[PDB]
Amino acid sequence: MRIILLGAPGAGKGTQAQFIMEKYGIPQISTGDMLRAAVKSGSELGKQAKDIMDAGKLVTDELVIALVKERIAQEDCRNGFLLAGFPRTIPQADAMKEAGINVDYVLEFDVPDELIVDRIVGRRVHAPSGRVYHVKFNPPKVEGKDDVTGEELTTRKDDQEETVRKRLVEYHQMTAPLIGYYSKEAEAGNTKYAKVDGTKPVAEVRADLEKILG
Ligand SMILES: Nc1ncnc2c1ncn2[C@@H]1O[C@H](COP(=O)(O)OP(=O)(O)O)[C@@H](O)[C@H]1O
Ligand SMILES: Nc1ncnc2c1ncn2[C@@H]1O[C@H](COP(=O)(O)OP(=O)(O)O)[C@@H](O)[C@H]1O
């Protein structure tokens, strides 16, 4: 099973990707996580992203295409994968198509813009794994601690209100056109498309996704 999650920053993609990876046994491919990890480790492929993410802007297509190509070639993707945060531009989607990377489901998270800032300013992450929490809306069992390892959560350097508003502008200009892109692909029979109400509680969105995926 191959899945793309579409939606604005803060729509809930990383949150729901974790459940899907747990239940269906396919890896989550998050370009944001991969880029942040490359910066942290000083990896030659991706360390360049530091100042760009800080500015709320998109990394170059060629950098994230290279990262994703490297990642999905790995054996743990042989049976499928989930993309969360990629593709982010029409050229990134076309690069997938040209490489023959078809997907089974495209799942769009519908969330009002007005909810995004308060979601992202409360976001806390377990950097080693990517797991995501919210201090008020989806808290860990123990404050400031990852549920799975118990390790300290952190706040992403780019999760400030003003940076979020810049990311939302980028989303509307560059990334929202992928909704139509994959709607058209679904009409051709190349994927299944579904839209979900991302304002429901985390557990209910999860249940809604399980209905679709099986
Ligand atoms: N259904 C929801 N209701 C309220 N908050 C949510 C919901 N889903 C996720 N969140 C929280 O909002 C923030 C954004 O979710 P996240 O999954 O990181 O979004 P994305 O990966 O789409 O940017 C996180 O702090 C997360 O805990
Ligand atoms: N596919 C991508 N193309 C370009 N830039 C990306 C991509 N994925 C992540 N980024 C960069 O990483 C930043 C954080 O993205 P991400 O972790 O997906 O956060 P959010 O879920 O809040 O959108 C983006 O603002 C951008 O700089």
DSSP state string for the chain = -EEEEE--TTSSHHHHHHHHHHHH---EEEHHHHHHHHHHHT-TTTGGGHHHHHTTPPPPHHHHHHHHHHHHTSGGGTT-EEEES---SHHHHHHHHHTT---SEEEEEE--GGGHHHHHHTEEEETTTTEEEETTTB--SSTTB-TTT-PBPB--TT-SHHHHHHHHHHIIIIITHHHHHHHHHHHTTSSEEEEEETTS-HHHHHHHHHHHH-
Sign (positive or negative) of CA dihedral 110, 205, 80, 39: positive
Domains of the chain, by residue range, sit at 2-213
What residue's CA is closest to ligand 1, atom 12? Answer: 119
Q: Cα(158)–Cα(142) distance, rounded to whole angstroms?
A: 24
Please tell me if the CB atom of residue 31 comes closer than 6 angstroms to any atom of ligand 2: yes
Resolution attained, angstroms: 1.6
Based on the number of CB atoms within 10 Å of its own CB, is 24 exposed (0-12), middle (13-18) or buried (19 or more)? middle
Quick one: which atom of ligand 1 is closest to the CA of 15?
17
How was this one solved?
X-ray
Please tell me if the CB atom of residue 130 comes closer than 6 angstroms to any atom of ligand 2: no
**CATH ID of 2-213, from 3.40.50.300, 3.40.50.720, 2.60.40.10, 3.30.465.10:** 3.40.50.300
What residue's CA is closest to ligand 2, atom 23? Answer: 9
Q: Which amino acid is at 22?
A: E
Q: Cα(84)–Cα(115) distance, rounded to whole angstroms?
A: 19
The pairing of beta strand 192-197 with beta strand 81-84: unpaired
Quick one: which atom of ligand 2 is closest to the CA of 14?
21
Residue pair 65/95 in contact (Cβ under 8 Å)? The answer is: yes
